[PDB]
């Protein structure tokens, strides 16, 4: 029947950005119209495809990538960004055709005295490849001296907590982000809209 958009946007659990969730959506029909119109989503920006023309188009694969970040960091979910989220947590490709949907979730993903459940990676030796996921927890060597698995002077634990409080201003608030990833190949199409 219809592609399962209830399962991705109204999921009970949203992942931390370093451990982002990829659900694959294939072999169904998808009405993106109700999503674009909804004022629930503050951010709904598409790259390389018009938001009007979503129900016309046909794609080989559509992936749903979903995670929770800070409100400032929503800027980094775009092709050709840099920053701690784009370099070390979630990287889009340069040739990214797809849509970035985000909304505020301050009321669910903050509790009083901080929500320490959501983390982000702060250092990595290289920047990530596109759509790469790192859940490693080795100590980052920031200095000349080797780390021996211990948080030391120039030896740092790579995952940092957001620690979302509701008293934080809007830039430091939890936003849930869904990334729709349209892949086009020389393969046959699997997901078209209602109008095709």
């Amino acid at each position, epitope marked *: 029947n219809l592609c399962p958009f209830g399962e991705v946007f109204n999921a009970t*659990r949203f*992942a*931390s950005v*370093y*451990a982002w*969730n*990829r659900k694959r959506i294939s072999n169904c029909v998808a009405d993106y119209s109700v999503l674009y119109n909804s004022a629930s989503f503050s951010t709904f920006k598409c790259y390389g495809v018009s938001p009007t023309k979503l129900n016309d188009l046909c794609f080989t694969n559509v992936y749903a990538d979903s995670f929770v970040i800070r409100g400032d960091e929503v800027r980094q979910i775009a092709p050709g960004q840099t920053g701690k989220i784009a370099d070390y947590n979630y990287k889009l490709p340069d040739d990214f055709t797809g849509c970035v949907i985000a909304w505020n979730s301050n009321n669910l993903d903050s509790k009083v*005295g*901080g929500n*320490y*459940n959501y*983390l982000y990676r702060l250092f990595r030796k290289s920047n990530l490849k596109p759509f790469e996921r790192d*859940i*490693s*927890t*080795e*100590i980052y060597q920031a200095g000349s001296t080797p780390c021996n*698995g*211990v*948080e*030391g002077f120039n030896c740092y*634990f790579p*995952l940092q*907590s957001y*620690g979302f409080q509701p008293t934080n201003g809007v830039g430091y608030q939890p936003y849930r982000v869904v990334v729709l990833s349209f892949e086009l190949l020389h393969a046959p199409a699997t997901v078209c809209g209602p109008k095709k």
Partner: nanobody
Amino acid sequence: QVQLQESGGGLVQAGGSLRLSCAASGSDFSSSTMGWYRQAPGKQREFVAISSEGSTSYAGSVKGRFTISRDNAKNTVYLQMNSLEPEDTAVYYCNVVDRWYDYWGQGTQVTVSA
């Protein structure tokens, strides 16, 4: 859905030991990341000991005191907590990360008196 079975904890004398366990069910925990984080009251939650697939990794004050082990067969991670000090009083939460999500335990209270 995925669940985590935290077990262990309670009160101990300073210099005492403990052992925490966290057993994982509901998913594929091949090459997964398992270990413990602690939150003393009013402080930020900070990490204690953790194994991702490449390396295991320990907090600064617990090297030599605490030891992390897992058997992949039972999908359980263990934390042998020796030489306990009243600084170590915190709620201890296990963290399991599979291919799809990071999951947290509910938290076992560990309390050390002088």
